[PDB]
């Protein structure tokens, strides 16, 4: 109820807000920050505090606990994020849904973190004042991911953030880089076609002045998805050319970024490059914000990889608990693997609708070819000369006349490495392959060895930097 | 003896007669008083469906949950509790080591009858801490194994197996290893490693005494078939077929006697026919055999590979006759196997020659490197990003 809730809400707010604030004030020190911001800060603000303890809308108290921003517009984020449905898109609060301010209680104490309202609020050209107001901004809009709320940030409730920003800190941008991600999402979830660009574009200009890779990088990615879904293909295509993405970027922003690029490549007809980026994306973030995203990654994963020429097992996919999204997908994997052209394309044509939202749909057409190609590949390697009639029956080709032409097209690329005799009706294997040779096994070993180096350097560089920092500052 | 429960259990699980088998299957738990664990146990057992309990129907009508199962459970538990109390209290007044030990062995044996896996570990440890005869100690572990197999989840048995391993070494009793060996084989048939299951089953047949076995006759029939899966023809011919040991073990094999003959003769046609039959009669019956796919693949590879390995040429007509399988079918099955290239053969349908490359060179050893190499490639990278964040 209301008396108990208010107390509970202030005490949780204060602890979380004070810590968050304390890191920016110290100033960005990159090595130390990277561990602090990734695991700790983001996770406590998002999952741990808001959801647990009293209700899941601590926000009416949150405004009164500490200053959001000086106008009553930010103070009325009890009317721009509880306004829609019943207390936003989250559990029912006991706290008052009111215009201007909720209640009238001011537990802003004399404490700096706890911030009195005329005192911090002014949106200074000094970098300090925007920086605390943004820390409070972070917690409200990071809820958006948990909630899946729509149009309670599309209107002023994070359009407001632009006004707070004046000069901005370099230190500010690393944390602000997380807030920006959430601004896009609210419009993008419903697939609203309202002005995502203005706010993100505004943030790009400051971030370049400050020299913080994380903030400029994170905007390029969000932007890329907004446009693709919208069917503003041209903007999305151009944007990729800036390319910046630091290692101190968050695990969710990386997985999102890899997926988006993966789509752009795949239609251009870089099946080879597309496959690689998308596979990396599933792997790099196991995370917890990733869970929601991973299902999307699995949809694309199965279609791209099959076009490139490799087959996976239906068995692999079924085992994880994201199983529910893989289910239509099991039919497709099997179709390519058995060698069943007719089953594979028909299923995919109807399925094509779902992909259109993503803009993956242009690929679905090209997919008819790949099953026949996968099929030919198993037959070519296996045999020496096998007759044309045998290949037509197994692969499930249309007729014997279809079968000669199609097998030929695969052959040209060279991954099959055969010749087909049209007037003699057999295919011959140019493969007489073996790695029993002179140098050839080293070549096989070489790729593994190259890849290891990238791991070794990344490891070495990273390993020393966190313990030396803790001895330097607070060692706990 | 408790091992009989398992034998019966495979039959309602597989399709070969569902309904009738269920009553009989249900009775052995009915006496033991299995109730608390029973509802949870049915779900796990399934890997070819059909529940051994009344808590689900899959393929046919299920037998009902008898009242006797509940009544025996309550009566046995009440008794065990009365007995144990006098002993635990007496233990303090008297020698700590002796009195508690005798009490604990009994208490454990009843907990295992319910099938409480947790109650079996707690009961076991106290006895071990105190003085206890090495033979007597080791015997106890057998019950804990029987419940894991009963449950027939791969995870649960792996935990039991780790404990069993530490314990056998301390006591040093060989009579006890034999009973342990059987449980170990029973789990092995259940997964993808029949190769391992074959060794365990063979050693035990030669010298066994009838304790912890479901029926010697069924067990001997089964043992020979498993040896084939692991063992290719040059080993198989000597050990099983012509060997001294098979007579000593005693004969109940004939469907299998013909099976071994077909590989030795170099007449494969009858091998394939028998393969199909062996899946229906042995495997289904038995509770243990999931991922049936492995069994089939290996057996079929064995036949193909032995002919091909010996011969770099055969003509197509001869090759087709010997194999006794249809032409499209011989090709398709092989196609999977050739990719791995431990066989590594081509088939002509224009030259009418089936060629075998037969690498025993750098090719052979290198191909395996690649497959292992893929698994290592994903793991290392995944580990690197998780730690960085």
């Amino acid at each position: 109820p209301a008396p108990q809730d208010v107390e509970m809400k202030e005490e949780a707010a204060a602890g979380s807000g004070s810590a968050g604030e304390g890191d920016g004030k110290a100033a960005a020190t990159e090595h130390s920050q990277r561990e602090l911001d990734t695991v700790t800060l983001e996770d406590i603000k998002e999952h741990v505090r808001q959801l647990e303890k009293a209700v899941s809308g601590k926000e009416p108290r949150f405004v009164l606990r500490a200053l959001r921003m000086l106008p009553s517009t930010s103070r009325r984020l009890n009317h721009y994020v509880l306004y829609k449905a019943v207390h936003g898109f989250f559990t029912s609060n006991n706290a008052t849904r009111d215009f201007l301010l909720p209640f009238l209680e001011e537990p802003m104490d004399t404490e700096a973190d706890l911030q009195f309202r005329p005192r911090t609020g002014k949106a200074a050209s000094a970098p300090l004042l925007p920086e605390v107001e943004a820390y409070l901004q972070l917690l409200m809009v990071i809820f958006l991911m948990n909630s899946k709320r729509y149009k309670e940030a599309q209107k002023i409730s994070d359009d407001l953030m632009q006004k707070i920003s004046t000069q901005n800190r370099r230190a500010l941008d690393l944390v602000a880089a997380k807030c920006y991600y959430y601004h896009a999402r609210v419009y993008e979830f419903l697939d609203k076609l309202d002005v995502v660009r203005s706010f993100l574009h505004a943030r790009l200009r400051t971030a370049t002045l400050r020299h913080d890779a994380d903030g400029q990088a994170t905007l390029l990615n969000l932007l890329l998805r907004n446009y693709l879904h919208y069917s503003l293909y041209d903007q999305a295509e151009k944007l990729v050319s800036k390319s910046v993405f630091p290692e101190q970027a968050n695990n969710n922003e990386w997985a999102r970024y890899l997926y988006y690029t993966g789509r752009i490549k795949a239609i251009q007809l870089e099946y080879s490059e597309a496959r690689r980026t998308m596979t990396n994306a599933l792997r790099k973030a196991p995370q917890h914000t990733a869970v929601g995203f991973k299902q999307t990654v699995h949809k694309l994963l199965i279609v791209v990889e099959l076009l490139l020429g490799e087959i996976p097992d239906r068995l692999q996919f079924r085992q994880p608990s994201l199983k529910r999204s893989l289910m239509p997908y099991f039919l497709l994997t099997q179709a390519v693997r058995t060698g069943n052209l007719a089953k594979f394309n028909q299923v995919l044509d109807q399925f094509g609708e779902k992909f259109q939202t993503d803009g993956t749909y242009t690929l679905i057409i090209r997919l008819r070819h790949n099953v026949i190609k996968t099929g030919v590949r198993m037959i070519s390697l296996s045999y020496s000369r096998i007759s044309l009639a045998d290949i037509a029956q197994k692969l499930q080709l249309d007729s014997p006349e279809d079968a000669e032409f199609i097998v030929a097209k695969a052959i040209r690329d060279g991954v099959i490495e055969a010749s087909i005799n049209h007037e003699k009706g057999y295919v011959q294997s140019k493969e007489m392959i073996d790695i029993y040779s002179t140098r050839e096994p080293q070549l096989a070993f070489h790729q593994r060895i190259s890849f290891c180096l990238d791991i070794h350097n990344m490891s070495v560089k990273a390993m020393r930097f966190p313990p030396k920092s803790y001895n330097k500052d607070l060692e706990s | 003896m408790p091992l009989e429960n398992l034998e019966e259990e495979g039959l309602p699980k597989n399709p070969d007669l569902r309904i009738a088998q269920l009553r009989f299957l249900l009775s052995l738990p009915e006496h033991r008083g299995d109730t608390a664990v029973r509802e949870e146990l049915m779900a796990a057992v399934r890997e070819n469906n059909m529940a051994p309990y009344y808590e689900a129907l899959c393929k046919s009508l299920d037998w009902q949950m008898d009242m006797d199962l509940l009544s025996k459970m309550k009566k046995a538990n009440e008794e065990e509790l009365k007995r144990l109390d006098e002993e635990l209290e007496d233990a303090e007044k008297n020698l700590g080591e002796s009195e508690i030990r005798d009490a604990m062995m009994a208490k454990a044996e009843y907990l295992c009858q319910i099938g409480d896996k947790e109650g079996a570990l707690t009961a076991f440890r106290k006895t071990y801490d105190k003085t206890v005869a090495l033979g007597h100690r080791l015997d106890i572990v057998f019950y804990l194994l029987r419940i894991g197999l009963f449950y027939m989840d791969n995870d649960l048995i792996t935990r039991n197996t780790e404990k069993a391993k530490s314990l056998i070494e301390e006591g040093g009793d060989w009579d006890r290893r034999n009973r342990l060996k059987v449980y170990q084989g029973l789990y092995c048939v259940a997964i993808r490693d029949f190769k391992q299951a074959a060794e365990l089953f063979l050693d035990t047949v030669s010298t066994f005494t009838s304790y912890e076995l479901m029926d010697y006759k069924t067990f001997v029939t089964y043992t020979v078939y498993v040896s084939m899966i692991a063992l290719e023809r040059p080993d198989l011919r000597e050990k099983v077929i012509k060997g001294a040991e098979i007579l000593e073990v005693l004969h109940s094999l004939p469907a299998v006697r013909q099976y071994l003959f077909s590989l030795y003769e170099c007449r494969y046609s009858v091998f394939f026919q028998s393969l199909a039959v062996v899946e229906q009669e042995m495997k289904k019956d038995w509770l243990f055999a999931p991922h049936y796919r492995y069994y089939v693949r290996e057996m079929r590879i064995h036949a193909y590979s032995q002919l091909l390995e010996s011969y770099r040429s055969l003509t197509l007509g001869y090759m087709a006759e010997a194999f006794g399988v249809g032409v499209e079918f011989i090709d398709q099955e092989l196609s999977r196997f050739i990719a791995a290239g431990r066989l590594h053969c081509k088939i002509d349908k224009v030259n009418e020659i089936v060629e075998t490359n037969r690498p025993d060179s750098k090719n052979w050893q290198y191909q395996e490197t690649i497959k292992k190499g893929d698994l290592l490639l994903n793991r290392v990278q995944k580990l690197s990003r998780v730690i960085n964040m």
Binding site: - | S269, Q273, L275, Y292, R300, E321
Partner: peptide, 24 residues
């Protein structure tokens, strides 16, 4: 095709009978 073993039970029986009558 999830597992080859179900299909294979029918295949081996069927394939032998036809093949035998004809060639072997």
């Amino acid at each position: 095709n999830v597992e080859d073993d179900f299909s294979n039970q029918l295949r081996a029986e069927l394939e032998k009978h036809g093949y035998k009558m004809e060639t072997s």
